[PDB]
Amino acid sequence: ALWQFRSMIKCAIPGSHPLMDFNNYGCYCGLGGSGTPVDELDRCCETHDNCYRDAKNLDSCKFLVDNPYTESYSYSCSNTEITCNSKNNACEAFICNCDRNAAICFSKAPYNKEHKNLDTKKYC
Amino acid sequence: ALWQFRSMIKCAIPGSHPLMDFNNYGCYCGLGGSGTPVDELDRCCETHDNCYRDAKNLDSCKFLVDNPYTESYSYSCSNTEITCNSKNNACEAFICNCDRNAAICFSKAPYNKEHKNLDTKKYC
Numbered sequence: 001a002l003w004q005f006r007s008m009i010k011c012a013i014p015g016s017h018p019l020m021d022f023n024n025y026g027c028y029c030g031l032g033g034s035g036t037p038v039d040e041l042d043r044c045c046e047t048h049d050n051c052y053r054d055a056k057n058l059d060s061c062k063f064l065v066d067n068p069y070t071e072s073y074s075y076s077c078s079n080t081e082i083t084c085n086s087k088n089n090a091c092e093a094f095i096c097n098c099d100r101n102a103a104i105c106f107s108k109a110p111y112n113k114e115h116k117n118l119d120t121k122k123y124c
Numbered sequence: 125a126l127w128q129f130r131s132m133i134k135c136a137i138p139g140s141h142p143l144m145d146f147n148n149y150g151c152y153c154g155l156g157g158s159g160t161p162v163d164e165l166d167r168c169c170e171t172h173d174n175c176y177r178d179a180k181n182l183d184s185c186k187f188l189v190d191n192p193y194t195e196s197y198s199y200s201c202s203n204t205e206i207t208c209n210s211k212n213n214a215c216e217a218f219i220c221n222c223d224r225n226a227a228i229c230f231s232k233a234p235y236n237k238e239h240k241n242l243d244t245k246k247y248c
């Protein structure tokens with residue numbers, strides 16, 4: 001679930017403001033996404049977008065006929081470190097893993113301010 | 125912009141978890157929006173939607189070539205009172221008011237558990 005994904009990001013990037021920082025960055029960070037990613041961070045986002053597409057295709061997620069951002073899962077934070085609970089059944093694990101991978105990726109990639117809030121219409 | 129809407133929701137509603145409690149509610153609180161709203165709180169969401177559409181068709185917003193969540197404005201919170209700053213240019217002031225009206229609306233609309241995370245393709 002999206003709020004979880006936001007919570008995950010905070011985990012890895014302790015003082016972050018995830019909506020403020022990552023929603024409307026590059027061509028792919030924020031609802032929507034097309035064109036060539038503008039940096040590694042941007043590529044983190046296109047990857048998460050794909051993962052979710054994969055998720056919706058995955059047989060285990062067949063009864064999931066809403067957005068993956070609507071699928072609750074179980075995860076926990078231990079000092080910047082994210083764990084997707086063994087508990088999770090197969091769809092929820094895959095999604096949780098999608099969201100987990102993205103936050104780590106976020107927490108590794110450079111954030112280039114200039115890439116924020118792009119005229120996606122004119123550059124993506 | 126979206127981060128500011130979240131904060132507005134947190135202002136008008138001290139206890140709130142905006143992404144967790146208002147995202148994926150009813151037929152309109154979330155992505156897209158069709159169907160018959162299920163209750164007042166949904167209608168707050170439908171109303172906001174209608175407000176962002178009004179903004180995409182606003183002459184004052186003609187150079188806003190993208191979605192109003194990406195539009196940043198000036199606001200303040202005081203004693204559960206959200207303030208759209210008078211120095212806002214018109215598009216900004218318009219967007220800001222769509223948000224506080226929705227944020228205020230959430231605060232007075234009753235929250236129905238049973239309308240949370242609905243099967244939308246089925247019921248909306």
Ligand SMILES: CCCCCCCCCCCCCCCCOC[C@H](COCC(F)(F)F)OP(=O)(O)OC
Pocket residue numbers: 005006009018019022023024028029030031045126127128129130131133142143144146147148152153154155169
């Ligand atoms: C701001 C308040 C939201 C909570 C109450 C809102 C009431 C209902 C209005 C709809 C809310 C908008 C829902 C859409 C959210 C879009 O969010 C999608 C996401 C934006 O940031 C997500 C992040 F992970 F970064 F935190 O982009 P994505 O590319 O998936 O991730 C980078």
Ligand SMILES: [Ca+2]
Pocket residue numbers: 028029030031032033045049
């Ligand atoms: Ca995206």
Ligand SMILES: [Ca+2]
Pocket residue numbers: 152153154155156157169173
């Ligand atoms: Ca909506």
